[PDB]
Design a protein around this ligand. Structure first.
Ligand SMILES: Nc1nc2c(ncn2[C@@H]2O[C@H](COP(=O)(O)OP(=O)(O)NP(=O)(O)O)[C@@H](O)[C@H]2O)c(=O)[nH]1
Ligand SMILES: [Mg+2]
Ligand SMILES: [N+]
Length: 403
């Protein structure tokens, strides 16, 4: 139907190591919220991990977006894969979050992608984290639980999150999900597992603030995914970063292609509900006229025409991870060609070191220039991650644009 704004909107999502329970939690959240609010459609496990390749491999691969709401706010929730081979998709999801739910298995404790997701969430600008300690149903010993919490809090401190301050909710996504299946009308106060989900929801309501958003600046929406709707056309999805978009607006597709191209917006939706106007913070799908799904792609940005100039070469201040932070064992030279991650963009770039800087070692803080093989929407102060051969190697921020 039509989208009615009644509440402040916030984007959250789930991150954390493979199998720790991100998707089960995502599903439990929709079920628990739906019992209090009739506007919430429940999403089952299989509705989220829906792709044939996900069924085949038994993991989340694609980000999924689900909707739910509390009395306080409206939420779009991005569920991210935890598998190490799909970090690229996790980063794109994280780039949409005003807050992340870090799911950590009580039975396993923090694992390498617990660490890596925290680090990367930061480098695409996730400002707040709530922790959900999942699978406590499997853990008898309260001392392990305390140990796990202790480890998570400290790990978050390592990446300059306020680890001692974040809410840590202990529960079981699966047992809440099960209770909601047996009684979908189960309200708060009736069941201890479901009430842990309410504890998570309260914590999200109150600890993750509604972001300050600029609706007056030029329209800008990083593209997350692109698909063809049969009978309607090409839809580009994403979180609107700033400004507003209305059906009928001309927009520019910026980045990744040699030339910027224009199109007209012909539809705007949030969770398959019609938006009169999309605004900063909205998680939308934008129908684009006269372009195929081979002419818009992840990592481009939709922008007010002439508001953004795509760039290829910049200076950056970079920290290179130590091996004990998931980084590489050895260093690199000029000519190193890793992947660079800016918002939803992933682009091969060439490290070019200063005269005199022969080598960069793990644990170094350094400045160098980068040349991307494709132009990308960039600006000074933009944070980015560096990855190569399937591992995270560094974090940086743009200091100056050059070309
Ligand atoms: N005992 C127990 N098992 C749980 C709980 N939540 C999830 N699981 C189990 O843990 C496994 C992984 O759950 P899932 O939600 O797919 O985790 P994920 O983090 O989304 N995986 P991925 O990283 O691939 O996206 C499943 O077998 C699921 O039933 C829980 O609260 N308790
Ligand atoms: Mg999953
Ligand atoms: N998924």
């Amino acid at each position: 139907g039509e989208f009615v704004r009644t509440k402040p909107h916030v984007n959250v999502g789930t991150i954390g190591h493979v199998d720790h329970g991100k998707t089960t939690l995502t599903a439990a959240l929709t079920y628990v919220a739906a019992a209090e609010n009739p506007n919430v459609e429940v999403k089952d496990y299989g509705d989220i991990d829906k792709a044939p390749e996900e069924r085949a491999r038994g993991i989340t691969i694609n980000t999924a977006h689900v909707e739910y709401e509390t009395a306080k706010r409206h939420y779009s929730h991005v569920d991210c894969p935890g598998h190490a081979d799909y970090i690229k998709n996790m980063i794109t999801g994280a780039a949409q979050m005003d807050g992340a739910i870090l799911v950590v298995s009580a039975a396993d404790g923090p694992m390498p992608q617990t660490r890596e997701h925290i680090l990367l969430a930061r480098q695409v600008g996730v400002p707040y984290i709530v922790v959900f300690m999942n699978k406590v149903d499997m853990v008898d010993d309260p001392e392990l639980l305390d140990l796990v919490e202790m480890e998570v809090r400290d790990l978050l401190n390592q990446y300059e999150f306020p680890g001692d301050e974040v809410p840590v909710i202990r529960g079981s996504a699966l047992l809440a999900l099960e209770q909601m299946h047996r009684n979908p009308k189960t309200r708060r106060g009736e069941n201890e597992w479901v009430d842990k989900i309410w504890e998570l929801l309260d914590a999200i309501d109150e600890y993750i603030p509604t972001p300050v958003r600029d609706v007056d600046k030029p329209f800008l929406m990083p593209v997350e995914d692109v698909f063809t709707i049969t009978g309607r056309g090409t839809v580009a999805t994403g979180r609107i970063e700033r400004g507003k978009v209305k059906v009928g607006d001309e927009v520019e597709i910026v980045g990744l292609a040699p030339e910027t191209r224009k199109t007209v917006v012909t539809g705007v939706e949030m969770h398959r509900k019609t938006l009169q106007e999309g605004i900063a913070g909205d998680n939308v799908g934008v129908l684009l006229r006269g372009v195929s799904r081979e002419e818009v792609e992840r990592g481009q940005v939709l922008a007010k025409p002439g508001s953004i100039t795509p760039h290829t070469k910049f200076e950056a201040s970079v920290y290179v991870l130590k091996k004990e932070e998931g980084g590489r064992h050895t260093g690199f030279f000029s000519g190193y060609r890793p992947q660079f991650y800016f918002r939803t963009t992933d682009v091969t770039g060439v490290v070019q070191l200063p005269p005199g800087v022969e080598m960069v070692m793990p644990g170094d803080n350094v400045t160098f220039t980068v040349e991307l093989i494709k132009p990308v929407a960039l600006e000074e102060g933009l944070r980015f991650a560096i990855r190569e051969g399937g591992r995270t190697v560094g974090a940086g921020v743009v200091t100056k644009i050059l070309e």
